[PDB]
Amino acid sequence: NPLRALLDKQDILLLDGAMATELEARGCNSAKVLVENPELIREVHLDYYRAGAQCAITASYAARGLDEAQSKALIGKSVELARKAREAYLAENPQAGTLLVAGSVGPYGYHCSVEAFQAFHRPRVEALLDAGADLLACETLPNFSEIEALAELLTAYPRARAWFSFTLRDSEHLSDGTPLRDVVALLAGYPQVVALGINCIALENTTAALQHLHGLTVLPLVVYPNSGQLADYLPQWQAAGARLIGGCCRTTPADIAALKARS
């Protein structure tokens, strides 16, 4: 468990934020930057580590024209860059403790078979795991059937660890309508899933959602919503069992810096 070392020493584990915002500042215009401007992506990760983030989440959301062996080299490269920045930060501040790189697995795109979802995600899971991600961020998941497929797929790789974050229709249901009490009940049978929560969601919908999950599981809860203060919710969220906190769309290293201070 990559989270056990940290959660035994501190109440809050800090995540990073969006990537696009920092890149826009440096004059960027999706996975072209991994080839043409890899140094920028290296620097953005370094900034978040500096602002106080303890876990980095990867860039570059594969491509038309490449086979699936080229895609993994691309996907893997984003993990490598996050790793380079981490080493760089550990050289600067040796007293910074344990830092992690999380490889991202976003949603498909609907209704598919479990095996259809598994064939789709398997390239990326292996690419991220082989590249050296400490854990897998299964995020922005709206579909229950797709959730099953990912948790089953993970069992093929015994050393993999992951969290599962979802999008919501309301405070009690997935975006596809599935009741949260079923999603939790499912994932409870999967020890590899080490954390649960929500992301890419509006701020004023986060707390109720967390509160509901808070009653269904004592797994560390994960929260990183979109920008409007984000650091102002940290008390409510922590009380709702949230232990991994960061930001999504429209967030910058500044929001994470605010979080560091409030913890």
Add this chain to the structure above:
Amino acid sequence: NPLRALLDKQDILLLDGAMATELEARGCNSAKVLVENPELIREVHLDYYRAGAQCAIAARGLDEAQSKALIGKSVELARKAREAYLAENPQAGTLLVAGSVGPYGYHCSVEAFQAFHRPRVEALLDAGADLLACETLPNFSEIEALAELLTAYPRARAWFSFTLRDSEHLSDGTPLRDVVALLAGYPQVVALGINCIALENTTAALQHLHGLTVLPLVVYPNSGQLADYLPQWQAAGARLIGGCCRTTPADIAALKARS
């Protein structure tokens, strides 16, 4: 870009001058005036706008939420004078308020520089500054940290002005070709130059930078005429000109005339 509107119409953008001189004239004797005499500071800014300036430019028992209200207030006052001036003479064009970001005064970590400057940057930006004056920067490492810190605020725009050891090196010894090469990778940095410097050290410095970038150069040195250098400086790529220590609205008035 706050500067394109002005730089598309005129060769020279006028900055203001010192503050202490005008305040001394009105009978002042660090942040006591922001709370006790805020009207005075409003007037000095109004005075500089009249003289021809187009751009206007502390905890101890206080927490950092109070400091930002103080720091923010100084931008607000400059904004009030601007509205006051634009009510009086509406045909005066576009005027800007620049929030100041001074030096750490050495060696600190990048994160230490960023933690130090983050309160003030957010305070100025939230208060409504049009751009940030990163001035009197002697230290290269502190310069990096600041350019990086700025990327956290995508809509922020800034200029970077430095102090020098000679005409080719920062006060910390770093060659200017390194400072320029670095800041060239940071689009938010919209102008470069020098400030708080002796008059007879300005032109050589500008001439060197002139060969390294075509960004608008910023110059505002200490008092000795300051307006007498305006041709030399403009020829050296300078487009933002004003004064620093010991300068008064008179020096800015002189510049207005010579352009």
